[PDB]
Every structure is written in C-alpha cells, then in structure tokens.
Amino acid sequence: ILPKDGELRPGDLVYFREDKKTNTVTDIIPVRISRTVDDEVLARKIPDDVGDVRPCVREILDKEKQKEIADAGVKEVFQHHPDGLCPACSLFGTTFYKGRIAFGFAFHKDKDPELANNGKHITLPLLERPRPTWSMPKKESRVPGRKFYVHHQGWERVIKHSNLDESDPNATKQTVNNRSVQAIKEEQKFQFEVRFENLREWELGLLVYVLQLEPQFAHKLGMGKALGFGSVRIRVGEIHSGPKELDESRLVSSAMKKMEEIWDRDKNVLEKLFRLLYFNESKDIKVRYPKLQKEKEEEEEESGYMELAKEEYQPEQRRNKLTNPWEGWGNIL
Amino acid sequence: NNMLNLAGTISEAFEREDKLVHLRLFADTVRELRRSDIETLDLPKGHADRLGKPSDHFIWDIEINKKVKLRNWLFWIFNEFRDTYAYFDWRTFCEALGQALYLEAKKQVPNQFSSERPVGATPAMEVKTPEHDPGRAAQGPRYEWLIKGELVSQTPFFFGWSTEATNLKLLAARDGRLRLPLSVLRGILRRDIKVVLDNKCRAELAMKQPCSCPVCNLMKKITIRDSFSSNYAEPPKIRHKIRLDPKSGTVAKGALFDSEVGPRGVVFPFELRLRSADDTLPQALKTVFSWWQQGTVSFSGDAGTGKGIFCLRNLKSIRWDLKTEMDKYAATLGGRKTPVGKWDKCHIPDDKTYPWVKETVEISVCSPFITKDPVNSLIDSAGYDAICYTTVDLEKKDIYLLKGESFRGMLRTAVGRGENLLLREHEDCSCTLCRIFGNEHNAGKIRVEDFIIQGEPRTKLVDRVAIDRFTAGAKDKFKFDAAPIVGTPTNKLKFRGNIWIHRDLDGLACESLKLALEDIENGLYPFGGLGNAGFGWVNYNPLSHPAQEENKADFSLTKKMELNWSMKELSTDKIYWPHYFLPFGKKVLREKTPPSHACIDENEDSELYSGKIVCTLETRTPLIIPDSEFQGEEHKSYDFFNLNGELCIPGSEIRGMISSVFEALTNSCMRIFDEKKRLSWRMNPNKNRRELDDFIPGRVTNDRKMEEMKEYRYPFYDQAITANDKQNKYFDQWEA
Amino acid sequence: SSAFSGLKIPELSVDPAEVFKSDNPQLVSVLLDEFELQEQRPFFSGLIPEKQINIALKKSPQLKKLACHLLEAYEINGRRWKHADRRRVLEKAIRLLEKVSNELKGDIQKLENNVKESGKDSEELNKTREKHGEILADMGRAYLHRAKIIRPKGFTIPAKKKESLRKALDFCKEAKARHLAGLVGLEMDRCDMSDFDSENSLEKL
RNA sequence: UAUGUGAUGGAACCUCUCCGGAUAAUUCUAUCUCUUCUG
Ligand SMILES: [Zn+2]
Ligand SMILES: [Zn+2]
Ligand SMILES: [Zn+2]
C-alpha cells in the first residue's frame, strides 16, 4: 500500500463505512483490513472511580476548540485545575511555579571508583520501546496505572553472557542496534546534599522518609532497569534546620496526620506499592519476557505473547495479574 | 513594501505550523545573522535521531510557499534583492527584514511584550530677546591651549539613538563607524566640573540675562571636537533583560527588552581647545582630567549596570600666546589645518576626591555553570539547544562571563527578601530598597560591572529527557542539550568583578549590601540557570563530612498505619514478570496558594523552615550511567559520566527517582503524561456481523463531502505466469 | 451596584480573587491582566472548558466599561482620595482608553479599503466612527482631569500642563465636543498661555 | 538662498527603573502485514 501524501484527493480509492446515524460517514480506511484507530483521546481514558490524575497544567486542545480559545486570546484562564496544585507539583514546581528543593551532584571520595567486569565493557542485549497496546487490548480498556520495576539478580547472567567467546552460540552479537557501556561495582558510596527553602514540616518529613526508606526496600536507577541494574539505597545523615528549632517527633506526627488525611484509612494501593519496592537478593529467582512465538517441539515452556493471550490471560482479564505485584506466568520446564 | 510583504508571508507560515511563540525570537535571530556574516554561514540541523539520520530543525526547516527549506528561501530572497537593488548589502537587508518582522509580531502577536513607557518628558524650546542694553566689557582672551588624548573603552558602552517616528540602537555614522557625540562629552565634562565646584546650576534654558557663574563662565570658552571610532566599524551585539515576579519566581507577562551594546576596546580620539586670559589651566579642569585618567567615571547611558567606563591616555598640551606669537599660531591655524610639530607633556599628578568607591569581589563556583542564550543557540552549527553567553575584546576569542545585570538582580532580590520589601509599593517610598537601587522617579547609587571568568574554561555536552509515568521511556524524540562550563570542588571556577558605590550612601544601606554579599558568598543563591539541578552552586563541598554511618531519625510508616504489607513467600518454580502496574488512588488533595518566594518567613497559616540535608548513596547492584560521547561508528562504546575525568552522578536522576516515588506515595497527579495520543489497534478478519464496511469511491472535483458508492469486482495484473495448460498441469508433481 | 463588583475599591486597583466566580472569560482575563492581584501568595486556578456562546473574540466593550466606571468613580468620590490615588486612577483610565482608541482606529483603517469597493456603503462603519468619536471625547475628559491637578514645580507653569492641555484641546476638537472644548479653553486662558491663533479664538469656542 | 551700525544655541547626557528565569531520570518488549475462492 502506497500511502497518500496528505489530505483526501478527489478521486482516491478507499473503503468507507456508513451506518444509519444522520446519513454521514464516520471513518476512512485505505483497505479492507487496516488500522481501525480509536475515537476519544488517552487523556479521558482513566477509570471513572478514580480522582483526577491529569496534570495540574493542562492542554485545551482535547477538542479542536483550542483554536476558538486561542483566537479569542483567553488562553491563560482555561489552564490549571479549578482546585489548584497537587502536592507533587507544589513541592517540585511546575512551569509557572518554581520548585522549593534542589538536588546537587554526587561525588566520590577517590578519583577512580571500582568498575564491574574488571573494567571491561558490557555488551547489553537489544532494548526496544515499550508498546502501549498490550495492557489496553480493546477500545473500552482503561489506563491501568503507573509502571514500576521489581528487583532481582539478573545482571549476573548478562555479565556472564558477555565476555564470552564468539564461537559459543550463547554469546551476544555486536550489531549496530546494541550498545556497550561501563558499570560500577556494588557497595560504592557517593555523597551529595539537598538544599530546600520555605517548606512546611509535613513536606520535610515526607521528603526525609522518601529519601530514607526502611532498610528492607531500595531504589532503582540507571539504564537497564529491567535487567536488574541500578538497585541503590540512600542514607540520611543530618538535617540542618538553621536557627529555627526542629525536632523529629513533630515531623513524624505531621507526616502521620497528613497521610491519614490523604489516604483516609486505605491500604490496598500502599500495600501494592510497598510490595514492588522489596529488595529480592535471591539468586534462584528468574524474571524474563515471554519471547513471542514459541517454536520447536517438546514443551518449550508455555510462554509466548500470542500463546499467553489464548488460555490463561485473555483480553478481558489482562487488566489483572498485571496490577497484582509479584505474579508469574509460567513454570520452569 | 517588499519587506512588509515578506514579513507578512513569514508570519503566515509560523501561524500555520502553530509556532507563533517564536516570532520575536526569529526577529532577533535575523539581526544575529546580520552580525554573523553570510560568506561562512552554515545553519544548524536536527538532533540526529536513530543511529545517524539527522532530523528536522524546528524553525529552519519550515515549509514556506512549497519551499520546504527556509535556509535556502532566505538566500534566494537575498540574491533577488541584491540583483534588483544597487548599493545593497547583507547588513541592510537583515536590518530591514528584522524591523519588519518586529512590527508583524507586535501586530499579530499581542501579550508578548509590556507599556507605561512615556513619562516626564514633553519637549521644550524657549527663546527671548533682551529688553536692556547688555553694555560693554574690557576683558578678552590672551591664550589658547590645545590638548591631545585618547579614550579607550574598558567596559561595553551604549549611546542611545532615537527618532520621533530595534526600538533603541547604538548611534553610528552612515559609513558604519561608531560615533561619540560632542554633546555627551560636554555634558559629562560640565557635570564633573559642577561636582568639583559644588554647584546646582540648571541653566534654566533661555532667561532674561546670561546665567554667569563659574559653570557657565568656563564652558563658554571650551571647544570640543567630535570623535569617531578609529579602529572599529563592525555591527554591535544584542543584550537581553527580563523582570521576574517575586511571588512565583518566574518572568512577568511581558518582561523582555533589547538593547544594542558596543564592544570593549574602541579608541576614541580626544580634542580640547581652551581660549582664556590665564597663563595656567584652571584647577577644576586639572581635577576632572585626573578623575578621567583613572577611569572612575561613567560616560555612556546605561550606567546602572556598569557601562561606559573610559580611560584617558597619552596626554599632551601646548600653550599659544596671541600677543607675541601670532605668526607661530597662524602658521598652523590653531593645529586644525596642519598637525602641530612639537608637543609639551603635562603632569596632572593625582587626585582622590572622586565620589565613587571601588570594591573588588571574588566568588568561586563549585559546580557546572550554565546560562541560556536562546537567540545565539539558533546560529551555532554545533546544534546545541542551549549555549553560554560570550563577549568580544578588541585587544586579544570568546570570553565566558555572568552579566552584571544578573548580579544586580540577585543583590536586589536578596535585600528585598531579607527586609521583606519586595511587595511594597515604591511610589514615594524612600526605603532601603528605593535608596540603594532607586525607583522610577529617582536614580541609583550603585554600579555593578560584569563578572569575567578567569582561566581556561571548557565546555561539556549534557543530555536530558522526559520519562512518561504511564509507560517508562522517553515520551518523545526531543532530547535536550546544553554546554555548561565544567566545575568541580577540587577545580573551582573563579569569578572576578568590580562594584562601585556612592560616597553619599548612608551606613544602613552599606550594611544591607554587606549582608547581601555575605549571603551570596555563603551560597543562598545559585549563579545562572538550572539552579535546582545542581548547576552553579557556591560553597559546595559534599565530602567535608566523613560520610554517613548507619542512619538517624528512623521510623517505620507501615507499622504505624497497620499495613499488612503482604510479606508472603516467593516460589522458585515460577517465572515472574519484570514489571507491573500500580493502580491509582481515590482522593487527590489540591491547594490554590502555595508558599510565596518574596518573603523569607511569613507564617500566615503554618510555620516554614529552610536549610539543607546531607545524604549518601551506595549501589546494591551494578549501576549504568552512559556518557554523552562514544568511541566507534557501528557499535558505539560508552564510558561512565565524568566531569573532566572525575566520575559523578547528575542530580537530575535523583530528582526524577524521588519525584516519581513521591507521586507513588502521596497519590498526586501524573506530572509527565502524553495526554494527546490516540491508539490504533487492528481489525480481526472475522468475529453479530463480523464486517459491514460498504464499498464507495471518491467522486470528481466537487465538494469533498460527496462520495459515490460502488460495487466490488475482481481484477488481474497480480499473477505469476501465463502459458498453456500443459505448463499448468506440470506445476504440480513436486513431491508428496 | 449593577457593576462587575470585582475591584476591591476604585482608588486601589486590586482584586481579592473571586474573579473566577463569574462566567465570562473575557471579563476574567481583563480583570486579571490589567490589575494587581493582591494577596501575598501566588494564585493558581482556572475555569472549565467546553463553554458555549463563544468568547465574543474581543475586549473593547469590557475596556470601555472599565474606563467609564473609573471616570464615574473619580467624578463622584474624587475629593476624599489623596494625590497618588487620583494620579494612579487617571493614568490607568488614560491607558485603557488609549488602547481602545488605537484598536478602533486600526479596525477603521483596515475596513476603509474594503468598504471603498462596496460602492459607498453607509453601514455600521458610521457606528464605528461614532464610537471612535466617543472614545476621543472620553480621552479628552481624562486628559483635562489629569491636567487640572498637575503640581506646579518651579516659578513658571510646568510644560506637562501645557502639553496635556494641548492634547485635550486636540482630542475635543476632533471629537466635535463643545462643552469640553469650552472647559479646555477656560483652563488655557487661566494659564496665561497664548499659543492659540485668531482661528482658535476663545470667543468662538 | 541671505540683507548690513547688535546671533553666549559649544546655551541641553535619551537619561531613569527590570536575575534569559521556570518544568523534564538519555531512557526502553509485543508483533507486524490483508484478500482467500465454491472446497
Ligand atoms: Zn500536579
Ligand atoms: Zn550657571
Ligand atoms: Zn521602597
């Protein structure tokens, strides 16, 4: 199919669709089987039983009335939510506002920290852009939520697969679509500071708790999060409140009051969030991708994206087992 | 008229693409092109997405009248204009196209600029004939003095040129040479002599009788020649200024100004001719010359931002007597017909009476420094989205610096925050802020010079991206670029500058200035932009504290809120998904009035605290942070992020992780979200009707709404081969 | 009040929020972009999209109403205010009227060429000219009121008063106003200035 | 292209007021593609 350069020409041959309606045509398709496309926009695909999660700074162009407003010139009055700014946009700042916290650079005590793989380069496998049309199968599907990565020990397999003789079929090819990078060994320390001004005590307490989580959990950083790289932990050493007095008890009580006011004794979402931050150090836990189109004879696992959508997941239910953290799809053969 | 039509056409293309927010930027960019010269012109290109394929620039690759490339359309228009009109050059074409586009912007794009501009002017011209006989006198000239000299600009200057009907431009001769008018020199000289003699003369325009008095008695016998730039004729540079909003910390609605500024090092010849009945120079003239030789006074317009400082060098003079040396004088006609042969040297030893005080300031920066130059970023072939400001010196190469306007703004903001005077009305106020810096109906008592970086600074490429919250990864191809100057705690950046204050300033203002300078040195205010990302931090020594051992102030949120936490147990015989999705909450708490920025502490509803937090980061698993440079052509090898061979972690990554976890906890909105996107999906071949699409075809060149139906048939021209039936019967019998 | 009821007080051009309670977006935009927001903390709020009846695509009636309200307030309660308040109110009214007059003059200039091909079409163009004349008369009123209170610095009459009186006279003469022209002439006579010629005689005015 | 017993216009600084600022982790897995001929 040679696509038309632009617009509709008087004489183009395409396929149309007509219903009763008001005797009009609603869509244009080049061939009999093609992209059906979607009416409506992703902005209003959020569930109806959830508070407004759209950005506090919005875009009017959800309809093409962006033109009527723009020509009218009233563009600074139809932006922002009628209620105001969320806690995240207030603390970190938006385009019109300014953030009240600043993060500095992190340095090392010595000039040369230890590097993994004895200083050699690591040949990572192919990484491709996520496809949004997997958790949203049908035209009536809703947005599942934010995406988070789990912790594991899969970097050992990547390192072992690299630094291997090219004769072995298990080696990683040095194609143009790959990328070779360096890494820093574990247990290497970096030091930095965070500067803040004009913060309420509950904001300060929440920020301190976010920076310093419980010892069980850890944060994630850097390239190749899906492969297990970048699990880091941040420690808080001292708070400089200046001339004004400050005690940790008031910070804890204020954070408790704010969290109680916000969540109002709801624990499902928080439990799911805290399950995703668990640091799994077991070397016997394997996480991979289904590897679409399972082939060959024998069991060869039950994986495969097309195969997985036929028996246990199904289009109606794939908005489930994905919002439940730490769930597997297939057993070890 | 051709320029107006071209401007209108260009304004149409931008409007059509939906890019009306860059018309003023292009209006300044065309004058930057004027300065940049045409012979070696090479406009930038795209960001080179994918592996090696360049992309399309967001301004230079706009389709205009079927000419996709603006870079060639502009050249073709210039060639056509040069062919049509004689005595035509690149500079005039660019100037005409610039003003025209500025007019189109002011016309079609409102709210992009400020305008209470006309106040306290009104032109006045008075004349009056005498009513009484003036009389007769008996004192006349008996001596003549010719004084040589040169004026060298040690700081960029600015002389305003304005007509009744590029708002402001530096005045220059029709041949391009920079010009220093004699009116400015006479005014400066009379102001200095009035300061020396402590007078308050105004000259009252035309009065009944001549004013007399020493100020009008000495300028009546002084002749000054007009001067021109001896070694400089190039077009000047453009400087930009903004006005911030103290409450929000951002620019105002229409705060943006432009002003052409001359270079540094232009030599202006000096000529003075004094004819009076005295055998020695007046003391006031010698005092003024002593003041000028040290460069302690300002000569140009924008003196509030430290501009127009000139130094006088190579002073020499000769005295002529018209009573006995008339022939010697008439031989050279006073030194204007023929240059004088023998010159005598003048001492003019010293003077320490000038009313300004110079204090040097040195500030060391311990982080990368960046300042944005949007107009210059569109003419550099390197293609970077942001680049640092540079100037030119006629003595010696680009010099990186921080403009003195930014330093003045920082000082004013610091003083206002300290004394809570950033919101009070300043009409008839006379407070500390209205005294140090002045208000509209007053002037200032401080002159702030530019801060020149000392050493050999180096630039670096820094990359940034926006990671969507729904699907992890870049929300668009739009990578961001910058060229900061590399700075580390061990290898700091040193800034040097001069601040001039008036001798008549009271002690309280001096103490306030000292406190503001102390706060600046301590590091309450970063230099340049991107201050929240760790760029340009003063007094930053994160390694002073000997690391953080264990943790202090530890509490568990899950235990206090009775979270089950679903401890559970993992199984070895299952393969888990690498990523999951977190369901949204129910309640989002929004507020209308965030805390202000103009007050250091104002507890209208709750207490506020300000300080800093010391942290430490360690890696449980190997970490990968790529650099901006690669070694290879096909398989690009990467190295770890470093600042001149020193490994470090940018603050943007930590900001992003902390922010994302923050929306995870507090159930805030999705700050980065591609809300303008529609999915496609596919139609299944069969499925209560599986398919119901009718067959129709587009009609002739009638109204586009009409469309005629059709019936589907079969067609040939997609086959394999044509032959007799024997070949068809032989097609089989392969095997099986 | 039968007015907008958004301004806190005529002599202090501030708005204590509450502007968004109205439905007209043009009124909100005008009250926000040309007045002090008051308060001590930034205000971040907006209206709801998908509003019908369009936006009327112009601001001239609202600006004219603001100018008329400011002049009426100055006429009624101008004695109690201090000098700074009078100066501020007069300057703001002059700026708004000048913007309206410039917009109307530009619109008339562009419409003149188009109506030239309409075979001498007497239509709403006449009403636009009448509106321009009314705006000119209001500008003359504002200029005269501003000139009447200029502080006399120095022994002689300041130039500012002379230029203000000349501008007021020009506006009144161009607007075909008789009472305002007479008032301007009376003010000029008391200033001892004699720039007027025999054609612009005080007796004829 | 002046009109003559009378010209301090070298007799006047386009001056004054305004942080090119704000927001963004150089990151990453599900297909793609429509005409098949009674089977
Ligand atoms: Zn928000
Ligand atoms: Zn005098
Ligand atoms: Zn003040």
Author numbering:
A (entry chain B): 1460 to 1792
B (entry chain B): 293 to 457, 463 to 693, 725 to 1015, 1022 to 1070
C (entry chain A): 2 to 206
Please give the exact wording used by the authors of the publication that reports this structure.
In the present study, we use cryoelectron microscopy to determine structures of the Desulfonema magnum (Dm) Craspase complex to gain mechanistic insights into its regulation. We used cryoelectron microscopy (cryo-EM) to analyze the Craspase complex, which resulted in two structures, one showing clear density for crRNA and all protein domains of the complex (DmCas7-11–crRNA and DmTPR-CHATfull), whereas the second lacks density for the regions of DmTPR-CHAT (DmCas7-11–crRNA and DmTPR-CHATNTD). DmTPR-CHAT makes multi-domain interactions with DmCas7-11–crRNA via its NTD and CTD, forming two major binding sites. The overall structure of D. magnum Craspase revealed that the complex adopts a ‘closed’ conformation characterized by the steric occlusion of the first segment of the spacer crRNA by the CLD.
DmTPR-CHAT organizes into three domains: the N-terminal domain (NTD), tetratricopeptide repeat (TPR) domain and the carboxy-terminal domain (CTD). The CTD contains a caspase-like subdomain (CLS) starting from β sheet-4 at its N terminus and terminating at β sheet-11 at its C terminus. The CLS is of particular interest because predictions suggest that it acts as a trigger for cell death or dormancy via a caspase-related peptidase activity. The CLS was also similar to Cas7 (± substrate) and PIGK (phosphotidylinositol glycan anchor biosynthesis class K) with the root mean square deviation (r.m.s.d.) between the C-α atoms of the protein backbones of 1.1 and 1.4 Å. The binding site of the NTD has a larger surface area than that of the CTD. At the other site, the CTD forms salt bridges with residues from the palms of Cas7.1 and Cas7.2. In contrast, the CLD in the Craspase complex stably associates with the complex, showing that DmTPR-CHAT promotes the rigidity of the CLD.
